[PDB]
Amino acid sequence: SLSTEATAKIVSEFGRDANDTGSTEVQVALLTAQINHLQGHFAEHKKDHHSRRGLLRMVSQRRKLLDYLKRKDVARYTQLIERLGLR
Amino acid sequence: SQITIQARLISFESNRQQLWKLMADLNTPLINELLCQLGQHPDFEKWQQKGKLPSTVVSQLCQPLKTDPRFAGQPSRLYMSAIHIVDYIYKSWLAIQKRLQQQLDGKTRWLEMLNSDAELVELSGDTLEAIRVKAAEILAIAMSLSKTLFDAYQETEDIKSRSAISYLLKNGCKLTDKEEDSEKFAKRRRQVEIQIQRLTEKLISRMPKGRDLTNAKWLETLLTATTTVAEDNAQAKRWQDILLTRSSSLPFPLVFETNEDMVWSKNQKGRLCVHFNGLSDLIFEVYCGNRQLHWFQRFLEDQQTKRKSKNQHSSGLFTLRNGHLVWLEGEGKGEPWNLHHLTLYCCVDNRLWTEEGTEIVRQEKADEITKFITNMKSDTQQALIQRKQSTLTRINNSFERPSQPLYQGQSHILVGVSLGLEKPATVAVVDAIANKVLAYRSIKQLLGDNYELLNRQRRQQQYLSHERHKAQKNFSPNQFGASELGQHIDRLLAKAIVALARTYKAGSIVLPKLGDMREVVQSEIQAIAEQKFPGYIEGQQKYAKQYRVNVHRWSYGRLIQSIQSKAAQTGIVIEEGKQPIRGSPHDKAKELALSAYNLRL
RNA sequence: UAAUAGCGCCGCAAUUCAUGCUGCUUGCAGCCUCUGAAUUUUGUUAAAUGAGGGUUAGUUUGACUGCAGUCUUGCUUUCUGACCCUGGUAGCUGCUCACCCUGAUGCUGCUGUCAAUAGACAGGAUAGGUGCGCUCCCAGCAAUAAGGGCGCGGAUGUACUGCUGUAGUGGCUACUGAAUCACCCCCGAUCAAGGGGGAACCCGGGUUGAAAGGAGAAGUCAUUUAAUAA
């Protein structure tokens, strides 16, 4: 999981205001940071079957938050996808 | 009659690495030739209807793949190994599917036919006695009885009077006076409905999957799933089912179906050596215990005897039949050809060891080849016949071999073996003309000094099943079971039963027609559980877990095979019969042997 | 302190016969000295089973020829012995927790010493409960079965381990500590390789624990762990 400094850095950059501890844009940015660091380890230690459980949860949570934001506000959804480099 | 023996093969890296590269490259057309039939082939449903693969189709898919830029680097015998394996994969899978289709139809007839006594009265518009009288007429006509009654129901509808034929069939081809409980009938008719449902859920089976060593689909899916967003729950789960899949680490084995495509020799150091057709640069050294060495010396003696005799003796009687070359998985770190272990598994027909046994195979093949030639009676067909006629003349020229008189047993003395859940075996030796039991054995006698091993097997199954549960909750790789102990116990009983059959000069060993006990129990316990937890499906599954699990762990097919193998190596005939539903384990064994004796005519 | 009960095994006490023991009537009479089946009972320095994790190309189960002489290979497994350990730091990573109640196929349970903090040090497979074990039972913990209660911010169009967080417990990779044995001791080789020196006993030769083998490929179902979904 992320360092303390790394979370604080990510919430301050995706949060719309000093009040955002966990808007849908902050929650997807923290799952995205985790997934990138986890793909770099799980492709190397292919035998680590306890980390595949962690990845498949963490990707599935991101997709639900994105589908919710798509219907709620397509402009916020489009800007979030750009800023996270997703397709 | 056949057995498999084995040795590890040793050879310097360059040879164990070159062979690995050919098998990692061969393993791939073993997958592309399944896909060329899995989805590509248009006729596939005609094969599923017939239950058999056409004898040339895999070769006709492989021949143009021999020049493929991906597959072209391999010897002519490695392509025949590919064609062999893919032929056997589908020739098995289609034959599994056909018997399931036949069972589903063969019970769909019965679910339509199985009626309550009140339904027979309504459907006939007549009395249940009129039905008993017509059932008595049908038995009088009939006198394969069960088959004849199913034929007489298919044909001959006879103004719905075939309802009386269904009355015979549900009563086990016999007349019955009693009128049945509709609750017992409801359980009975429900078991048939459950078996129909489960057969369809099984018949919808997966296609054969090849050993993809590349991880390419898995790596592509990983980078897809982590960098992109799925458009559907079905797509997000499709990536999960791929990412959870464990990939294979070993290529398919080479199969050498011609015994002469292995060449044997003796090394300067006195050790035995082998080489394969198309790999004749790569000499390998045999390493095996002296408990098995006598076959590997016999391989070389069979070969030298033919070569010393200007090919006038045939490998139609060579002790080696076919070889399967396989990489057994090693442990720790290293390149695959330094980590794994080349092992050569030789199929051997054990009755070729002796001269008296070789003469059986000479007569068996000489009769089969004579018939084949007379059935053929083409261009290359003319050369196939010359090869068969030349085998038929050469097979008469004998190898110098060990002599041992054949076993002979008394045609009236039989060993009955009774299998069950609590007693894996129990034995009665019957003189069938005296109607006299010569001896009985229970398990405590039937493996003597080893009787502690049954208690060990039950402790080990229970202990290890709990440890596997605890280990899975922690994602530990430690996953172990009593399978090799159960295999040893089934072999101890197989030796003791045949030693007992030899002791009393028995003419045969009798084994029960157990059939598919696992599926039968699974439907009986479900039809019952549905009456005790209606609507609560989780409670229905929990109803008798330990009984259903003990039936799925019951090794009856492996004990039946272990006895068959050891009996046929000794020369004792195997016979079969219905095992009684009631009586003690001894009475079951007694009546089983007497039933198999009564079935002689 | 506690663990009374339930369930599975292990013998021990009997009772009933036989697949056994004496006869000739080759099928009866007779009993339980053995060897075995069935039921019941029992937990008496009775007897018998008895899963903390690991270690040897180990020994014996082998082939051929008339029980004697030749040849012998180190494969895949099951036991019995014996010995060793109860681990070390260097990264990567999963899960779990605002705080409470219920407490799960949940974790933990040995001897001695110092602390009496939660942990070190030295011993060790006798290691909570019984003759021996359990998903059962007792004791402590319980966030990491599950359900319910419920505080304050963000979000609030159905998403919300998403906040209250530095520890707990795992997984994996690299290096490393001990045993690398089959009567002990010593020097080595692990796709190979053996050699040297002793103790004890039997009648200068042996002995110094035994067993099993049909394998590959594909498909399926049984519970049981994880993820996902309505």
Residue numbers in the entry:
A (entry chain S): 2 to 88
B (entry chain O): 2 to 144, 173 to 406, 412 to 635
Paper text:
We reconstituted the ShCAST transpososome by mimicking the natural configuration found in programmed integration. Using single-particle cryo-electron microscopy (cryo-EM), we obtained a high-resolution structure (3.5 Å resolution) that was sufficient to accurately resolve the interactions between all components within the 961 kDa nucleoprotein complex. A 3.5 Å cryo-EM reconstruction of the reconstituted ShCAST transpososome reveals an assembly composed of one Cas12k subunit, one TniQ subunit, one ribosomal S15 subunit, four subunits of TnsB, and two full turns of TnsC with six subunits per turn. In contrast to the heterogeneity of the recruitment complex (captured in the target pot reconstitution), transpososome particles reveal uniform TnsC directionality, in which the N-terminal face of TnsC interacts with TniQ at the target site and the C-terminal face of TnsC interacts with TnsB. Because particles containing 12 TnsC protomers were most frequently observed (73% of particles used in final refinement) and yielded a slightly higher resolution cryo-EM map (3.5 Å versus 3.7 Å), we refer to this configuration as the major configuration. TniQ bridges the two TnsC protomers closest to Cas12k, however the TniQ–TnsC12 interface is much smaller than the TniQ–TnsC11 interface (325 Å2 versus 915 Å2). We identified well-defined density corresponding to the TnsBhook at 4 of the 6 TnsC protomers closest to TnsB (TnsC protomers 2–5). To distinguish between these two possibilities, we used local refinement (focusing on TnsC) to generate a 3.2 Å map, that is sufficient to unambiguously distinguish between ATP and ADP. This improved map demonstrates that ATP is bound to all protomers. Comparing the structure of transpososome target DNA to B-form DNA, we find that target DNA is only slightly underwound compared with B-form DNA (11 bp versus 10 bp per turn) and does not match the layer line spacing of TnsC in the transpososome (~40 Å). That is, the last two TnsC protomers in both configurations interact in the same way with TniQ, resulting in a translational shift of TnsC–DNA interactions. This leads to slight variability in the number of base pairs contacted by TniQ (5 bp (major configuration) versus 4 bp (minor configuration)) and TnsC (30 bp versus 31 bp, respectively).
CRISPR-associated transposons (CAST) are programmable mobile genetic elements that insert large DNA cargos using an RNA-guided mechanism. CAST elements contain multiple conserved proteins: a CRISPR effector (Cas12k or Cascade), a AAA+ regulator (TnsC), a transposase (TnsA–TnsB) and a target-site-associated factor (TniQ). These components are thought to cooperatively integrate DNA via formation of a multisubunit transposition integration complex (transpososome). Here we reconstituted the approximately 1 MDa type V-K CAST transpososome from Scytonema hofmannii (ShCAST) and determined its structure using single-particle cryo-electon microscopy.
